[PDB]
Each structure stands twice: as structure tokens, then as C-alpha cells.
Ligand binder design. Structure first.
Ligand code: LXS
Ligand code: LXS
Ligand code: ZN
Ligand code: ZN
Ligand code: ZN
Ligand code: ZN
Lengths: 360, 360
């Protein structure tokens, strides 16, 4: 069976299980089960499934080199699918709540969930809660007797928490740290002293890399009982490297990709986000360019957003990007090498993960 | 050591642990650690700690009748405190997000968290996420090697999920079920056909009773290794009974308790909530009273909210309440009796839980 068709079948199975359980154990009525079915589909489906499919790919890698009964191969693949969906639903929770937090309009060329007419924020916040809750329901049902249960739950728990911490670092990235205070409304930075590479890297490490790269790779290893085939410090390193790269592309696209292809009107400039573009521009700008960026950044006004796009264009950030891209290609190749000392198989899975990131 | 002083000490310990971990493992800076410290304190402290303290009381019950080394008594009490705080922080998550969902203004005579000037909704939604995440961090740190770890996590997971389902039943309680649809903005019911006792009971069972009564009682049993001293079906039954009673009081107070003593301006009428008052009033009203209630319920206008209060006053709902209260007193006493067949100790803890509910 092809990997994707398997993965999607398991979605239907998991859906049926969740909704059936709601009826038998939580007293749900048919109409509210229908609302939750629609919410699930709308929030969990329509993407590329890159994350969930990475768990399946890693597991398939190991299957090709490890002796097992056919029923065990099936169980492993079914576990990798279930695990893949836990990450997809975790993502879905974070996109629902982030979209509400950020006042976002669209996502993937469709309205954000909370904007649907029969949803509203009042229900969407709690729908997002449920999305994450279903990750735990899945795990305890399908993995109840599995040896990896505790390691999987503890890892998932830490990556969820890292993710929420990342969100905090992202939403507070335009404030001055010394001024954070629940009692006082937060001014936007005027010095941009905190728009540095290290500060950027911390935001991206936590807000994206743990759930997008570390978790799929390590879940793949856990459902394969293969964690001893890797040096976990190397899996971490490569994950952060690849994840940082992924985000830099997303940061570049928010500004320069046309909204129809993007799935979104980009607002990082107006939101004063600590993007790769802002940081890289500040890292090469002259005094006059810095003052012009400060006078225009983080304002709704289109004339000022255009001035910021103009400064980025004239600053030749394509050069800085190609240079970054070079160095990442270099570092990721070294780490893949270091990954072959213990698992050719695993190193190859990371190679595929890198190819799918580095192309898109 | 008195129970409360213990409980509060452990808060400080747990806080220190969480924030120290953020610094050593999640790269937090001092200012953001301060913001999270303040968020924690503001959202987790200032209540009566009824929930968390119930875990401690149940554990203390068992300590009085079970032979243990002193260091084991301490470990049990420390575990009951940690477990108590997991429930308090779970509550804190739900109050933060509910207050945002409902557009609430005050809670406990202070502004809701999201209304603080340096918070805003953008951060509060994610602060609420973190609150729940800290429940898992606590459990995996303090209970790592405990035999009850898996049972505790699986129970906590199910009660969290019940709670979110309860929230869904509560926020959708003024809509007609057959009309729920993410695509269509939801009209308020015009028939109030779904304002029944059974429908009420389902909302309260899930939205309140599982986290407020079932979880503290059962956590108490789990940290005591005492789950075999009870018939779990009876613990469930008594929990739902007592929890339903607790909510009926809260429903009555929302309408009739003056806002300074309440901690809150009550808006259940304007919000068209399926309250005990609405359901009990509909269960005894004549045709003209029903039409007057329909013409005024679920509107912001003070004149109409007063008309609804007037209808409730003239309808003599104090009689229905005393009758309900009677029957609950009766049923809870029977269940406590049925609880003594296996644990006098546990039945007594439930007796205390009932006395603290039935008085306030
Ligand atoms: C502790 C014993 N107990 C209950 O009190 C409820 N019950 C089951 C309910 O149908 C649903 O699944 C289980 C569960 C646990 C917590 C919340 C919701 C649920 C159960 O096992
Ligand atoms: C899987 C191996 N691994 C990591 O990649 C990161 N690391 C630790 C980090 O300091 C923090 O605690 C642990 C953890 C797990 C997930 C997210 C965040 C954290 C760790 O053990
Ligand atoms: Zn965001
Ligand atoms: Zn972006
Ligand atoms: Zn509410
Ligand atoms: Zn209330």
C-alpha cells in the first residue's frame, strides 16, 4: 500500500473512533458530532501532511532493513500513521489558536476557522483545545499497550510546551524585553536592538522546529523501536538547522510571494515581526537605511509597508540568502554524514526531509 | 504541618522548578520568566483552592488509617499537593480561555487576565495554553517513577477532554441543535425546547463536575494507592450529584447575588445561558409567562433583563430549589452510605466535600 493512501485511510479510522467514542462515552448528540467532524476536516486536512508523513517515511526506512512478521510491519505502519496524525492535529491546534491570536484572515486560501459564520471566536478557541485533546485520546487508545507509550507521551508533551514557549517568544519579539510587564501596555521597540540572529534563532527553534522536524523524526524512531540507531544530539542539531532554514523561506515568502500563491496576504512588516528579512537587513544597513526602516516598520499604512519592501529590495538580501543557503547545505550534509555512523537508513530519511524542504 | 501551608509551600516549589527549567532547558530570559511568574500567580492564586485541597484531604484521610514510614507520609502529601496544583492550573487554563471566549470583564473582583494592559488576547490565549502545559511538566517531573503515573495521566487526559466537551455543550446551549453548522451564523433558539433538565445536566456534568469533583477525589485515591478501597461507579455518581448541585448554586447566584459579593456582574440572562433558573422557570410556567420570557431572554437591554428577573422572582423558584436541595441531600447521604461498605475514610472525605459545597 502507498504511504499516503495509508495515511489518509488512518485519518478516516481515527475520525470514526473519536466521534464514535464521543457518542458512547461523552453523551454527544448527532448534530454536535457533525459540527466536530466538520471542524476536524477543516482544520486537519488540505495541507501536504509533511509532518505526519515524515513519521511514516522514517518508519518505512527501518522496515526495509529490520526483520519482522507481516502483521508487525502493518502494526508499525499503523502506529506511524496514528503518530503522524497526532502531530497533524497538534499543528491544527496551533494554527486555529494562532490565527485567532493574530487576527488572521486567511490560511491556505480559505478563511481561518474562527471566521467561519457558525464558528466564531467563542467556539474556535475551544475547538482548538479539543484538537489538542484528541492527540492524547488517540495516543492512549492506539498505544495503550505499546512499550514506547511513555517515551512518546513525554516527548510529545515537551514539544507541545516548547511550541507554546516559541509562540510567546514570537508574539513578544517586537517589544523590548526589559519593558515586558502585564500591568503596562507594550510599546513596539524603537531601537530594534533585539533583532539579532541569535534572538531570531531562538524564536524559530521553539516556535517551529520542535513540532515540524524534531517530533516527526523522533516519533518515527519511537514507533520503530529504533531510538538506539541514532545519537539523539545529532538528531536535535539537524532538526534545528533544517527547521531554521524552513522558517527563513517562510519569512522571505511572507514579504515577496504574491498573496494568491502564498495562501495569505503577508503582514510580517505591519506586525513588526522579527523576520529573517528584518534581522538580515539590520545586519548590513547604513545609518540612513536604519532610520528609514525605523520610521516605517510595524505600521498598517501601505505607503510605509512599501517603503520597507523598497528598502529590502535595494539591500540585496538575495545575496545574504544564497550565502545562508550555502552554509546550511554544508552543515546539513555534515550532520547527515555524522548520522550514517549509526544509521544509514535514518540518515537517508533526514536526507529526504532536507530535499523536501530545500526545494518547495 | 497544616494542610494549607503545605499546599502553598509546594506552589512556591513548583513555580521555582518550572521557571528554573525554562531558564536551563528552554532558553528563557529573565524578563519573560518574570512575565510567566506574574501570569502564574495571577491566574492560579487567590481562590479557595477547593479542588487542589480535596486531593490533599483525601490523601490525609488514608494516611490516618494506613501504616507508613514518616518519609512515605511526606512523599504522599507532597504528591497530593503536586496533584492538587495540576488541577488548580488546569482550572486556571480553563478560566483564562473561557474569559476570553465569553468576553468576560472581571473574575474574583479583578480584571480577567486578557484585559490586563500588557497581556492582551494575543498573549492570553497562549498563556492559557502554557498553564495547561505546565500540568504535564509537573506530572512528568514529580511523578516520573511513580506506579500511579500512567493512571494519573490517563485520567487527567480524559477529564481535560470532558471539560472541553462541556464547554462546547455550554457555548452551544442557546442554539437549536439541528441548526448547528459551521457555514451559517447561529440564531438563538426561539422555542427553548432544548432547555430541559436532562440537557442541563449534560452541560454541567461535562463542563464542571469532572474537573471540580471527580478529578480531585480520584487523584487523591491515586496518590494514596487506594483506588481499590472504592467502587469507582459510586465515586462517579456522587461526584456528578455534588457537582450538579454546585452549579445550580452558581446559576442562582449569577442572577441574584450582588456583583461586589459575586466577584462579577452576572450576564447569564443576556448570554441566553441554559441556567437552572431558565430551565426550572420553563418547567412550571404558564403560556403567558413562557411568551414573556421568550420576548426578553438573551438580550443586552437592561429593561428586558429586569423583566426576566421579575419573572423568576414571581415564579417562586426558591420552592423548586429547596425541593432540589432536599433530594440532593437525600441522594448524597445514600451514596456516602454505599461508600462506607469499602472505605469509611473515603466516605468521610466525600462527606467533607459535600459540607463545603452545601454551606458556602
Ligand atoms: C474515573 C472513572 N470514570 C469516570 O468518572 C468517567 N468514566 C469514563 C467516561 O465515559 C469517559 O471515559 C472515562 C472517563 C474518565 C474521565 C472523564 C470522562 C471519561 C470513567 O472511567
Ligand atoms: C528529543 C531529545 N531532546 C530535544 O530535542 C530537546 N531536549 C530537551 C530540551 O532542553 C527540552 O527538554 C528536552 C525536550 C524535548 C522536546 C522539546 C524541548 C525539550 C531533548 O531531550
Ligand atoms: Zn502567530
Ligand atoms: Zn510566516
Ligand atoms: Zn463560558
Ligand atoms: Zn456561572
Amino acid at each position: 500500500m502507498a504511504s499516503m493512501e495509508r495515511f489518509l485511510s488512518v485519518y478516516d479510522e481515527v475520525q470514526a473512533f473519536l466521534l464514535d467514542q464521543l457518542q458512547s462515552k461523552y453523551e454527544i448528540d448527532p448534530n454536535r458530532a457533525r459540527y466536530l467532524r466538520i471542524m476536524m476536516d477543516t482544520t486537519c486536512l488540505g495541507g501536504k501532511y509533511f509532518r505526519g508523513m515524515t513519521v511514516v517515511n522514517v518508519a518505512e526506512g527501518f522496515l526495509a532493513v529490520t526483520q519482522h512478521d507481516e502483521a508487525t510491519k502493518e502494526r508499525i505502519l499503523h502506529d506511524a500513521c496514528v503518530g503522524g496524525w497526532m502531530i497533524e492535529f497538534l499543528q491544527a491546534h496551533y494554527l486555529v489558536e494562532d490565527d485567532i491570536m493574530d487576527g488572521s484572515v486567511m490560511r491556505r486560501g480559505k478563511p481561518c476557522w474562527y471566521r467561519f459564520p457558525g464558528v466564531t471566536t467563542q467556539c474556535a478557541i475551544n475547538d482548538g483545545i479539543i484538537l489538542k485533546s484528541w492527540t492524547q485520546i488517540m495516543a492512549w487508545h492506539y498505544f495503550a499497550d505499546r512499550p514506547f507509550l511513555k517515551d512518546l507521551l513525554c516527548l510529545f508533551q515537551k514539544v507541545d510546551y516548547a511550541t507554546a514557549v516559541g509562540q510567546m517568544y514570537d508574539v513578544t519579539s517586537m517589544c523590548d524585553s526589559n519593558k515586558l510587564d502585564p500591568e503596562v501596555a507594550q510599546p513596539m521597540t524603537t531601537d530594534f536592538a533585539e533583532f539579532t540572529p541569535a534572538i531570531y534563532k531562538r524564536i524559530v527553534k521553539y516556535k517551529t522546529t520542535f513540532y515540524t522536524y524534531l517530533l516527526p523524526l523522533v516519533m518515527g524512531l519511537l514507533v520503530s523501536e529504533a531510538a538506539a540507531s541514532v545519537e539523539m544530539n545529532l538528531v536535535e542539531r539537524v532538526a534545528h538547522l533544517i527547521g531554521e532554514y524552513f522558517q527563513v523561506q517562510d519569512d522571505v515568502m511572507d514579504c515577496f510571494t504574491p498573496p494568491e500563491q502564498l495562501g495569505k496576504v503577508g503582514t510580517d512588516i505591519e506586525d513588526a515581526k522579527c523576520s529573517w528579512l528584518a534581522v538580515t537587513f539590520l545586519g548590513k544597513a547604513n545609518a540612513a537605511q536604519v532610520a528609514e526602516f525605523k520610521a516605517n516598520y510595524g505600521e498598517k499604512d501601505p505607503a510605509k509597508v512599501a517603503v520597507v519592501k523598497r528598502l529590502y529590495s535595494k539591500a540585496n538580501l538575495q545575496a545574504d540568502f544564497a550565502a545562508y543557503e550555502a552554509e546550511v547545505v554544508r552543515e546539513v550534509e555534515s550532520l547527515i554524514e555524522q548520522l550514517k555512523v549509526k544509521s544509514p537508513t535514518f540518515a537517508e530519511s533526514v536526507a529526504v526531509v532536507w530535499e523536501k524542504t530545500h526545494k518547495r
